[PDB]
Ligand binder design. Structure first.
Ligand SMILES: Nc1ncnc2c1ncn2[C@@H]1O[C@H](COP(=O)(O)OP(=O)(O)OP(O)(O)=S)[C@@H](O)[C@H]1O
Ligand SMILES: [Mg+2]
Length: 214
């Protein structure tokens, strides 16, 4: 019998409102979700790479600096794995929903008015939540050199959980798994996702591997 300690957290009020707005509103073009996944991976890779310039030992946990993208139609998931800096448990708590972001209120105001559209979400410091444009549930597995591997999960509804993760060790970095909404499954089509990755990785300075499940 397996045992797991799970901790529940509540999203900061405006983040919760943003998630509701992202989930319960129609958006014609949701491609920004992929831009934001890749950008977060690139930022995490930069962070560990620059740390390695001043402390080479930080790469011992995983020498490669790369991104892997895995569309899986049977599972109805899109997965993106980076070997960036990773998040400790408290990093997840602080960065993935409990702490207010300066731009959340202003973004929602500009969405409501028409001053901004959904593609601009990254400019407002809340890009991560774009995953909920296309996914019902988001699962974030992460391993930072300073902590054990943890998994964050949320289907929105105002809460998320974090638990120790005993699934496939990452060595270092982050694996984000999007459980795709029925009406967004086209994003798992081989040519569609290949093109989207090309389009949204033009200036990315790390190798990307894109799988297709036969
Ligand atoms: N792949 C990842 N690796 C490490 N940290 C991440 C990753 N994805 C998201 N984060 C954390 O989540 C935070 C929020 O991400 P975003 O909402 O995209 O905002 P930001 O403007 O990228 O900052 C980031 O600042 C990181 O602290
Ligand atoms: Mg980001």
């Amino acid at each position: 019998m397996a045992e797991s300690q799970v901790e529940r957290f509540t999203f900061q009020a405006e983040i919760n409102q943003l998630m509701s707005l992202i989930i319960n509103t129609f958006y014609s073009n949701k491609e920004v979700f992929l831009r934001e996944l890749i950008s977060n991976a690139s930022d995490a890779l930069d962070k560990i790479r620059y740390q390695s310039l001043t402390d080479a030992s930080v790469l011992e946990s995983k020498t490669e600096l790369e991104i892997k993208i895995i569309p899986d139609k049977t599972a109805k998931t899109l997965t993106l794995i980076d070997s960036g800096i990773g998040m400790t448990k408290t990093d997840m708590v602080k960065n993935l929903g409990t702490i207010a972001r300066s731009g959340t209120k202003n973004f929602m105001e500009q969405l409501q008015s028409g001053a901004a559209d959904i593609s601009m979400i990254g400019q407002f410091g809340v890009g991560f939540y774009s995953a909920y444009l296309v996914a019902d549930t988001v699962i974030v597995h992460s391993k930072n050199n300073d902590d054990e591997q943890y998994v964050w999960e949320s289907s929105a509804g105002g809460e998320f959980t974090i638990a120790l993760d005993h699934t496939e060790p990452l060595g270092r970095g982050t694996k984000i798994v999007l459980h795709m909404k029925e009406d967004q499954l086209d994003y798992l089509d081989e040519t569609k996702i290949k093109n989207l990755v090309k389009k949204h990785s033009e200036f990315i300075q790390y190798p990307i591997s894109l799988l297709t499940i036969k």
